Every structure is written in C-alpha cells, then in structure tokens.
Amino acid sequence: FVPKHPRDNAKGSVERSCRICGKRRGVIRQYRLNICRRCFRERAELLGFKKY
Amino acid sequence: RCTKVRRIIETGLFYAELNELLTRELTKEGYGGCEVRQTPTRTEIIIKAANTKEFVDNHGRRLQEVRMMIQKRWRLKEDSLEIFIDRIQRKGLSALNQLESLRYKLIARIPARRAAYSIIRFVMDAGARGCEVAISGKLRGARASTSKYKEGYMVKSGDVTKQFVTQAVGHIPMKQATIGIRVLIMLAQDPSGIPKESQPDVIKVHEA
Amino acid sequence: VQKIRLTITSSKLPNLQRVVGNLMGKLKKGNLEVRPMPRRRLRITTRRAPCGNGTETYDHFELRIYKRVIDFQGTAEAVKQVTQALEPDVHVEVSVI
Amino acid sequence: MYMPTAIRRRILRCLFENGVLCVSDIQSGTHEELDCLNIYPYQIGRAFVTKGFCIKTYAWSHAYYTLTDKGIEYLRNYFGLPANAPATLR
RNA sequence: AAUCAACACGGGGAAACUACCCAGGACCAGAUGUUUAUGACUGACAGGCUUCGGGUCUUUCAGGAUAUUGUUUUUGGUGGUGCAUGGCCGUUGGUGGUGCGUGGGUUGACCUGUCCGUUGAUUCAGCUAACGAGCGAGAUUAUCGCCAAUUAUUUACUUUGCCGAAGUCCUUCGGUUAAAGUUCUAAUUGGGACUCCCUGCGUAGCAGGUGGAAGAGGGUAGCAAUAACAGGUCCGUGAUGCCCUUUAGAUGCUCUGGGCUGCACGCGUGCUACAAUGUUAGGACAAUAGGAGCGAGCCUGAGAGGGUGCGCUACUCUUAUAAUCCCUAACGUAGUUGGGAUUGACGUUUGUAAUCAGCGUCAUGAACCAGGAAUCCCUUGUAAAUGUGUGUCAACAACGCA
Helix, strand or coil: CCCCCCCCCCCCCCCCCCCCCCCCCCEECHHHCCEEHHHHHHCCCCCCCEEC | CCCCCHHHHHHHHHHHHHHHHHHHCCCCCCEEEEEEEECCCCEEEEEEECCCHHHHHHHHHHHHHHHHHHHHHHCCCCCCEEEEEEECCCCCCCHHHHHHHHHHHHHCCCCHHHHHHHHHHHHHHHHCCEEEEEEEECCCCCCCEEEEEEECCCCCCCCHHHHHCEEEECCECCCCCCEEEEEEEECCCCCCCCCCCCCCCCCCCCCC | CCCEEEEEEECCHHHHHHHHHHHHHHHHHCCCCCCCEEEEEEEECCECCCCCCCCCCECCEEEEEEEECCEECCCCHHHHHHHCCCCCCEEEEEEEC | CCCCHHHHHHHHHHHHHHCEEEEECCCCCECCCCCCECHHHHHHHHHHHHHCCEEEEEECCEEEEEECHHHHHHHHHHHCCCCCCCCCCC
C-alpha cells in the first residue's frame, strides 16, 4: 500500500479523481469541484447549476 | 472563513452528497427529498418521507443511525446539527415516492401493464393533471423493447416543464437484465398551496 | 457603535427577497438607521455527450450569485436580535467596521 | 489481513462508541478521527458483514458501516463491558 | 469511431502517475467456512547477490494471535460481448409534425377527423360525415438594446467647496468619512411594439411609409412531440446480465525503465507565408473571465529569469497602459530588411526525472512568386483581419469554450 512514487502535482493523485466516479477521465477542477464530467452532468441540478 | 463563491458551492456539494446518501438508507421509509439550512455554527435539515412512524419505532433509533452518519462524515459538532422529519401529505403526486412503489412490484414478478396501471391510477385519483410511466429494457425476448403507459395530459416543452412536471428515473437489477423505471407526473396549480401561478398557455376571462 | 455591515448572498432570487424584506423590516422595529453588488455567472461548459461520437455539442451551466449589502449603526444589543431569516440557500456574513 | 494490535482496538472502540464509522472508499487513504491507512477500517468492515455484525451502505465513494443488533452483543464479549453499554440514546 | 452523423472526437495538450500495452521485481485487498503460547505469523541495522532491497542470503535482534495447512468461494479487474441491457448523447429532422374519445365509411388491411388563399409553422382563414379534447408549433424562460422610479460621501462615479504642485488672472492635474446628488457604474420592481396608425394589394394576412430606442417571431440563444436507427459508450460510474480471471510465475495492485511521440508514403481539421494596401525601427484606445492562489512596489541581470512578498476571502487589491489602426523615418520588386523551417552551441525555469517540455541568446537563412481537377463557410456589427481571457495545467496551444 501507500504508493511510493511522489504524486504531489500529478494527474493520478487521489484528490484529482472524480469524487463520485473514482475515475479521472475528464475532470472539472474549477471552483474546487473535483468531479468527473459524466459524473457531473447526472447530478448538476442538485448542485444548483442550470441551463439558460 | 471562505469566499462568497465557495460558500455557495460547498453548500451545493454538501446537498448533493447528502441527497444521494438518503436514497440508499431510506428506501424502506419512502424518501421524498430534503432541504438544508446552513449556518456558520448551526445546521438544520428537514428530511421528508411517507412512513414517519418507521423512524419513531424503537423510540427513535432509526434516525440516530442516520444522524451519526451525517455527523461523522462532515465532522460537524452535535448540538450544532439539528435534524427534523416532516410528513408527505399526498404521497400520490411525489415522484420519488411513486417510483419506489413501481420498484417494489416489478421485483416480485407482476406484469408491467398491471404495475403501471396500479400507480398511474393511484396518481390521478390522488390529484394530478397527468402522468406517464416508462419501463425500458428486457422482458420476454432477447431484444429489449420499450413500454410507455400514459394518461391525462403531459407537457414536454419550454420553461413550463420545469415548474409543473415532477419526474424520477431509476433502475432494477435482476437475474436476467437491467430494467429502467421512469415516472413523469404533472401537477395542477393551487391558489397559494403547496405551483402558485397558472400555465402561460391558459387565460381566463371574467363573467359579465 | 461599531457601524455593522450585513452581506446577503444567494443562489435564487425569490429566496433572497424574503430575507432582505425581513432584515429591512426589523430595522423599522429597532429603529436602527439603515444605509446591490454585482452578480456573478459561474459558467461551466461541459461537452454533453459521454463518448467521442456525434457532433460536438456543449451544454452551458450558469450558476448565478445575487449579492446585496445592507449596513447601519447599531449597538450590539440591537444587532443580536436582527440577525437570527433562516432560509434555504441563503447566507448572511456579518462584518464589523 | 495483518493489522497491528493497538490500532485494531481503537478502530473497534470507534466502531463500538459511535456505531457508524465512515471511511473513504479509496484505499491507502489517510483516515480522520483515528489516524491510519483507510484499508484498515474498510477491510475489517466487510469481515463483520459476512458474519453479519453490520450493514454496508455506500454513497459517493464513501463507505458507511451501521452496526446492527448482534455486533452490540459481540463487542461486549470482546471489550468485557457490562450491558447498556452507543448512539441509540432516545 | 469510417459518407453526411469517424479523422484538434473520447474534453485524448500521454516526459512519471494517468494506462489499458511491452521487459524485469515486489504485494495479498487469500473475506468467511491439521499447526500454535514450549512462539502461529510479523519488522529490520550492516555487508553479499542485485537495476535499487529484509524480494532472496550470511549474521540475530524487535514484536505478539491480527493465525497456518487443506477445503469453500468472496472480492478486485480500463478482461470479452454496445448484436444481452440501463441511463446519457448524436442522428433521421428542430423539419412541422404526431396520434386518442364518441360518430360515420369498409368484409378487411385501413380511412375520415388530420381537407381553396395565407404563415417560419396541421400558422390562421374558411370548406365539410364528422364533432370534441389533447401533445409539438406558439406562449413561457434567459440575455442584448431604450426608458425612471427604488438605493449608494469608505466596494461606482460626478458637480461644487477646501489643501496641494505647476500655469503662474483662472487653464490642467492629484487628494479629501465634506456638502449635495445619480449623466456615466452596479441590479431589483415595472413601462415599452400591437401589423395599433396611414396608403396600396388580397376576410386570414401581405408590401411600403410616418413616427419610434427598437418594426414585422425587436436580435441571439435556451427548452422541444410521437415513431425509430442492432449508429455511439460494458475505456465514466457502487449502472449491469452472462462468459473467464483470481494455478497469487495473477487479466488484482504496485516500483524502476520503455512505449502510445516509432517513418519509403495516402487522406481530415488547423497554423504561418509568399510581401510595399508591406516588413523593420521609434513614437502615440477594449470586453469577458479567473484568483488563500493572484501575486503590489523596489532592487539584481543584454535577455529569459532571480530575490524581497504589499493588497485582496474581491465592482475595493491583482493577472492588466491589449492588438489590427494611427503618426515620423529606413527599405526598393529581388527568393530581398519578404519567409523563419531545419541544424550547432551557450544561458535558464518547471519537475523525483528534460533522454522527445517551454523561454532567452548568437549563428545556420530551406520550401514557398497565390496554388491543377476538385471542394467549404457565410446575409450585418455577419464575413475577413486583429488580439485577450478561460478549459486541460507542476511545465507545455498552432486546439476547444467565451
């Protein structure tokens, strides 16, 4: 366990995953959401985002 | 100590995790959404469900399983968290509740006709202008094929969808294949009930 | 006496306009003297298809942030009473100057 | 799994005291409340479930372990405490 | 993934991780159903083997039931099947369409309702064995443009008054909790445009005109019916059926290194040019974003860069005196001060790593003289030029969204 390669500023750090997804394919870091897009768009209306 | 941006987004992200949590606990109690009140030191949350007795049985032990699960997750202090419950009047017209009734049946091997026209009758008699029920996936054959059962009338377009139309999507895993359940329910406007204003289609002329 | 600022923030405008009415209403009762900040559109522009298939179409998701600032001279006794609205998705930061 | 002995007790006490422990779904993740790797509470949690001492509910990459009737009777046998004896208070 | 509807698409700008692929070496996440307190299993100093080692090995100390052996099968899998499926999305087609109740026609599939002008429109008008209810269209929502109410002297400004500096008799700057406000600034509630008005044409409406901030859906978006495509995605998911993998010399997970960047060649989207309506040198107005990371001012160095870290939880502080254009010079029709590819070296930043990253410096100074047959996009603040933010991001945009 405790993977020894550093991962400070790195794509596969554990912060960088989609929180819901657990996967990192297509991540939204802006406004500190840290959520994958497919994962995002299922549950965007709950967060208070809306189409206009 | 946050920005004016982040206090909105943290509270949004709080709510959506909280709501996906209380899908998976309160399936038996019959969940119907919630509201979150945020204060710097105090948090008050209204859970809403049909079977309010099923909480209060065993002198309110079931709520204290949930309340610790919230408290330990976000590491909030007790006293500073303040959960209530409040009952659903008219279970007929809430979408998440009636989804669960159609989920309850199709596990226990009722035909899909009879499962829909159970709830689609129960919605309309309770008090609603229309409702639609879709049961998408694999019954009988190797190909999947779509049932759609509708009554009343059901508005699909514009802004006026968002105000009037309640809806709820889900799925049932089975021995054979993954079905999808899907129930849209349109409402009547009340005079200041619990929508207020009428549709932008309709107008009413006074009598002379 | 430490002329105090409220700073009222919201996602939704109807839920805001209740709280502004109350916190302006209560300065009528207490009689404290009473003194719109520009709103943000947090636009996030995700590609709406999951896979790479199909014509590249993009949903636009604006979260809106309405923000108002009341402020007044008030003596710490009177201000404790006014602060205590409680609405969904509204915030009120108190700020001493 | 090999746990060390001292960390093992203060998990099963944090289980017994609270009733619900939360742990990140992700393994090799530092754990709050009790400090350790997040493999440690997670892998013991599914051991209890097989025997049937707790219920697992999973949401948003977070695992919740709500402790049932049997596990309350078991952990009095383990720690050696009189009955009554957590977070079922009213 | 392969016509449109694959080919700057998978937000896929891969130096490691990401990562599936290839070469080595570890780990057990071996859950739950005979051995062992007289040590089941576990951790490691130095020096050997070795890419590097408590993987192994010569030594020999540290812990303490969390077990071992065999039997069961959990769980994990970016393994296979999108021709088993859920959801989501593109498309047929955002075109004007779709089909119920009762009645009538037909043996019946089925039809009628849903048919001579008008509209973007099954939009209205009117015909009429049909009459009446729907859904889509419209309405509504969002913003841009014009208004005047409602607030604002420590988050925007203006006027007047004070105190400064120059001018040096009235002009321009900078400052001010100091008096009055709202034309600029910010954003809530309402008003506003309806083919209403006039003239032609044909009741439905159409064309022009006056006025008007705006005139014919005010502009632009958003939302968008039923019915289907074996179109896409099991490489987004604790969405998932079945198949096989778990014989641990693993298709689980992880460490070091390498790949996805390999080039006789063929196509797609783009970028920069072929100059003089230009380049070179010197001089002289934006908007939308984002930010407890942005990074003020002042020093250091040709330059890139470096040091010190003021303000700001933001209409306050900051990225931030944009670039075509304009005005003085230089050049002179040449593969030329056009063009800036490809190569040699030095000076550096980011990073565990520069071996295929970016920036600077001096040298090197290519193909290209407007592009055959073919094809694409576009009607007004549009095309074209011209920059700036943002997404990815430690570092890197010729790309996407604004």
